[PDB]
Every structure is written in C-alpha cells, then in structure tokens.
Design a protein around this nucleic acid. Structure first.
Lengths: 38, 71, 94, 135, 104, 136
RNA sequence: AGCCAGGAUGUUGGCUUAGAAGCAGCCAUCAUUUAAAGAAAGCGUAAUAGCUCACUGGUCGAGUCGGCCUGCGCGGAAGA
C-alpha cells in the first residue's frame, strides 16, 4: 500500500474509488499500484 | 522453405551489404522499376497482393525504410 | 453572417461598466465614418462563442440596435487579462 | 465513428452495385482468422465477386434498390454479403467450401431470379457450372 | 551471454583474415585478368579493389595495436640517467635525441 | 542562471507588487504559460522550469523566455542584531503580476506543449494556465 | 456500457546490439487484405511465442461523451 497526498491511475487497469471518506486506487493487475490518500 | 526476405533482395539490387543508419535523410543506393518487378515476381509465392503494382508497392515500402531511392 | 443583438446604454463609467460584467453582459462601442459614436452592451457568452472563430475579425458583422441593423468590423478587443473573458470591443462602421 | 453524410455515401454505392449484380449470397463473418478469410476474397476476385460487410440496420436502405428486398429477414444476426457482377452462380460454390473448410457458422440465403432461397436449396446455385458450359 | 560475446570476437578475426587470403587472390587475379585482355584502364580500375581491402586489414591491425582506454591520449616521457657518472648521462641525452627525432 | 551583466545600483528597495501585467499576449509563439497569481520567480526557478520543458520536447521547437530577473534581493547573514546597513545581494528575481506570459513555444503540437508546460508549472511557485495565440 | 468474433500479409520496417523479431536505444510517416488493424498501447521471453487495447462487424435498445465558466464541500492535516 502506497500512502500519499497525490493518488493517480498509473496503469489502464487501475480504478479510483472512494471508500468511507477516502480516495483509493484499486488495481487488479498490479498489487504495487494499490494507493490511498493520506 | 520460403523466398528470402525483401531487405536481403534489395541489398543485392542496390549493391550494398547493410542499409542506412538514419534512413530517408541519408540515402545509400538506387533501383529502377525493372528490378522492383523482378523482386516482386520472385516473391510472388509469398505475397498476398493479387496483381503486380500491388506487389511492387510492398517492396517500395521496404526500400523507403532502408534509405534506397527509386530511380 | 454573424448577427448580434445589443442595447444602448443608460449609464457609463467604472461603476456602471463593472456592474455589467457582474450581470454577464459587457460594454462595447460603435464609432467610425461620420456620425456620433454609440455606446452599447452585449451578452458575454454569445459573443465569446462567436469570436472563437477567426472569421469574426475578417468578416463584416451585423449589430441590431433597437431595430436598426448596422454593419461593422471588429477593430479592437480588450481581454480580461487571465480568465478567458472580454472587457470591451471597438466596432468601426464599414 | 461516422457522420450522417458518410452513411449516405454507402446507400448510393451498394444500391448501384446491385444493378450490375446478377447473383448474390448472404453468409456469416465470425469464426475465421484473416489468413482463411482472405482465402475467400482472393478466389472471390478470380471468379468476380465484390465482397462486402455493411451494417445490418443500414442495409434496409441500401438494398431497397430491387429486386433484392427478398433478403430483409436475414439481417437479424451476422451478414457477410456478396454481389457477383460477371459470371452467374460462382460465389454459391465458394461459400460452401468456406463453410466446410472451417466447419463453423450459418450461411443463410442466396438471391437469384429476384427471390429468397433457404439454406438446403442452394445446391442448385452451388452446382451451377461455369458460364461457359456449352463450349 | 559470454559464449555469444566470445563468438562475436572470434568471428571478427577469422572472417576478416580468410577474406584477405581470398581477397588478395582476387586482386592478384583481377589486376592480372586486366593484363590478359591487356587494357590499361581496366588495369587501373581493378586497383579500386585493393585500397578497399587495405583499410579492412589496416583497421584489423589498429584493433590490436591500440586497445586500452588511454591509447588515444597525449603522453609524457621521462628519460632518466642511470648510475655511472658522465658516460651514463650522455647515454640519456643520446636517447632524448632519438625519441624527439622520431616523434618529429 | 539569469542575472543582468551590469547595473547602475547594487541594491534596490523592496517595493510592492500591485496591479496587473503588461506582456499579456502570446506574440512570439503559438502557445504560452500565462501566470494567474502574483509573486516572484527567482532565477533558479526560471531555469529549473526551462530545463523541464526543454527536456520534454526532446529539442524540437523553439522556446522563448519572456521574464527576466532584474530585481536583486538581499539577506542578512545568521546572527545580525539588526541595523549596521543593508545586506548583501544573495539572488535575483522577476516580479510577476496576474496575466504575464512567462514562456512561449512553437514548432510543436498542442498535445505535447500542454505536457511540457505542465512539467514546468510544477517548478514555479505561482498558479499558471496554458494559452494559445489569438488572432487579434 | 456490457456481451461474442476478428485484430492479418511483404515483415523479426530499417539501423544498432552477445540478442533488439511492434514493445532497451536511434531513424522514422508503406501498400496489400477490406469489416478493419499501430510498420505498434501495456504486461512478458535470453529471443520468438504468450496475453491483450487502438481498430472493426455481430448482439442489445435510449439518451450519452468530456472540456470551458461558477457555488458549497472531501483528503492533504502529528505534541506534550
């Protein structure tokens, strides 16, 4: 999990979701691309 | 077996051993359209164009890529 | 053909003309040829979309001003100096 | 993808080819790789077959131009059309060796004499000879 | 990786040396094949074969001759006299005026 | 690092920075980076941003720099019980008003130039926009 | 938007490279097949292959794609 104030879609597979107040980036195809906004 | 590549049969036709380092600016040979049709008709086993002019423009594509003008 | 409607202005000056850009209009002027100069006001969005096209500045335009058509060229244009807007257009009569 | 004006070019172009066309064959597109699809269209332009695929709501406008309004039931599902200008029959043999060699897909109809002919009765159009039988 | 690299070295020597046996048999042939028909213009135009083959062989030598990273560079030379008084110091000069007169 | 060759005076007043900019139009090129806020570009900033956009076009193109750092700026060294004169000139700045065009490009397309001026914008302290040329 | 099928041929485009076959780097702008496909969008091989998007027909049946201007909000946000 990468935690950082600028979250961004890296691949084409990455998808931005808002869960419980918080922007995440779920990627299927790459576990590295998992991000959260703090 | 197949007929040999279009890059090898253009190198004999121009009279060189390897092509151009920076193509289309730099030019390293020449071919007239009698030799373009002989290279087209020797490859006429492999090529998927039905006519000749159709086969010849495919060979012109490899000639542009390696520096050879069509004199 | 680029058609514009207008209105003659009652007011003018700093206070008046800043109230226009609050109300999504803006002021312009028609001068040139013979007559008295005329003070007019224009919907901002209409004339923003028109002046996108570069034929605005070549062509002759057609300002309706209480019925009377006038045929005019876009002589000069002040832009607001960072946001994409307009603060004023001079229209010479052709 | 396209304008309303670009689809008006296709209604004029495919209606005009239907006048020159004696026979015509509806077929299927899917299943087949481009190596084996292009084998249909090489031997197509030997026997003289102008192969097309056109959109299937669009072809009701393009094939109003007569007498091939027979083939309006077929445009539900996939449709590789053909329009054979010179040489009658021709395509109807080649669409059955296209069907057998891959061994997939439908092959629906084939319009000759201005009439719809269903799938099992194409044997007549398939076992026509060359034009050019009497010599 | 290392075996294909070592083949790439040993191709560059064995290809270039065998085609200079056959290439100087070609030139000693085709200069002398211009003398058989005996035209003095074909005698001089077949010399264009040799001066192509000269700077393949002269650039194979240059690949051995120089080799390490510094062999392009400018150099210093420090001649030093040994240990025998004057006779040694004369020998040192004798050199200096040798390496100067061959760097000329 | 930009810096006048010689001046009259070594040191300058602080001044203020009110009002809007002259140099609003994109004259020299096709595209440009207009400022929207209000501050000082140092000379190191102006350079860092040129090296971004220069890198990013692969040297196609031409780039013009429209602003020049010609105000000097002093600092006192650390521990200086105030007074005892004005400090030394550490570094140079341009002052920027809302509406000044800073960079201009042409000889690239609007795909690439948007990306070049995005990469510059991250080095500058002031909020910026992309502008194309207007015909009048 | 989803769903099924096709994404080829000269050709590993050329040049570099132990290798460079669309996909280390550098130079670049073809026709052919026609439903259409980059002389290549991302994974990946020592390299091919492998997967897959642009592109395109099928299916399905009403609004939809994404910039500009403006209001109020979210994260960014740790101390005795």
């Amino acid at each position: 999990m990468k935690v950082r104030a600028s979250v961004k879609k890296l691949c084409r597979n990455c998808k931005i979701v808002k869960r419980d107040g918080v922007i995440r980036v779920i990627c299927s195809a790459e576990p590295k691309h998992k991000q959260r906004q703090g | 077996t197949k007929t040999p590549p279009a890059a090898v049969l253009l190198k004999k036709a121009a009279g060189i051993k390897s092509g151009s380092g920076k193509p289309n600016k730099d030019k390293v040979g020449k071919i007239s359209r009698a030799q373009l049709q002989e290279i087209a008709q020797t490859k006429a086993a492999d090529m998927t164009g039905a006519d000749i002019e159709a086969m010849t423009r495919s060979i012109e594509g490899t000639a542009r890529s390696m520096g050879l003008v069509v004199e | 053909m680029f058609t514009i409607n207008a209105e003659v202005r009652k007011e003018q000056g700093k206070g008046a003309s800043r109230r226009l850009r609050a109300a999504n209009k803006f002021p312009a002027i028609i001068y040139g040829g013979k007559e008295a100069p005329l003070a007019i006001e224009l919907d901002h969005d209409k004339v923003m979309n028109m002046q996108a096209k570069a034929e605005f500045y070549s062509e002759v335009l057609t300002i309706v001003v209480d019925g009377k058509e006038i045929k005019v060229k876009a002589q000069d244009v002040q832009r607001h100096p960072y946001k994409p807007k307009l603060q004023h257009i001079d229209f010479v009569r052709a | 993808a396209l304008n309303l004006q670009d689809k008006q070019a296709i209604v004029a172009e495919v209606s005009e080819v239907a006048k020159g066309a004696l026979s015509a064959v509806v077929a299927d597109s899917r299943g087949v790789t481009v190596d084996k699809m292009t084998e249909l269209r090489k031997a197509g332009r030997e026997a003289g077959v102008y192969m097309r695929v056109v959109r299937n709501t669009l072809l009701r406008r393009a094939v109003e131009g007569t007498p091939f309004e027979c083939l309006k039931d077929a445009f539900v599902g996939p449709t590789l059309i053909a329009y054979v200008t010179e040489h009658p029959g021709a395509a109807a043999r080649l669409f059955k060796e296209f069907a057998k060699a891959n061994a997939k897909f439908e092959v629906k109809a084939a319009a000759f004499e201005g009439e719809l002919i269903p799938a099992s009765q194409i044997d007549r159009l398939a076992t026509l000879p060359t034009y050019e039988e009497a010599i | 990786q290392a075996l294909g690299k070592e083949r790439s070295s040993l191709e560059a020597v064995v290809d270039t040396l065998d085609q200079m046996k056959q290439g100087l048999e070609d030139v000693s042939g085709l200069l002398e094949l211009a003398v058989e028909a005996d035209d003095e213009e074909t005698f001089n135009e077949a010399v264009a074969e040799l001066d192509a083959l000269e700077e393949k062989l002269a650039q194979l030598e240059f690949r051995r001759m120089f080799s390490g990273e510094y062999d392009s560079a400018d150099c210093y030379l420090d001649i030093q006299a040994g240990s025998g008084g004057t006779e040694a110091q004369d020998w040192a000069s004798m050199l200096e005026r040798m390496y100067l007169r061959w760097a000329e | 690092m930009l810096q006048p060759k010689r001046t009259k005076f070594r040191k300058m007043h602080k001044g203020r920075n009110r009002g809007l900019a002259q140099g609003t139009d994109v004259s020299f090129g096709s595209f440009g980076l207009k400022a929207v806020g209000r501050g000082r570009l140092t000379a190191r900033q102006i350079e860092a941003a040129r090296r971004a956009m220069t890198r990013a076009v692969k040297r196609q193109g031409k780039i013009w720099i429209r602003v020049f750092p010609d105000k000097p700026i002093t600092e006192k060294p650390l521990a200086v019980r105030m007074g005892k004169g004005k400090g030394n000139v550490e570094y140079w700045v341009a002052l920027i008003q809302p509406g000044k065009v800073l960079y201009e490009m042409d000889g690239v397309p609007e795909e690439l130039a948007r990306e070049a001026f995005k990469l510059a914008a991250a080095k500058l302290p002031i909020k910026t926009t992309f502008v194309t040329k207007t015909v009048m």
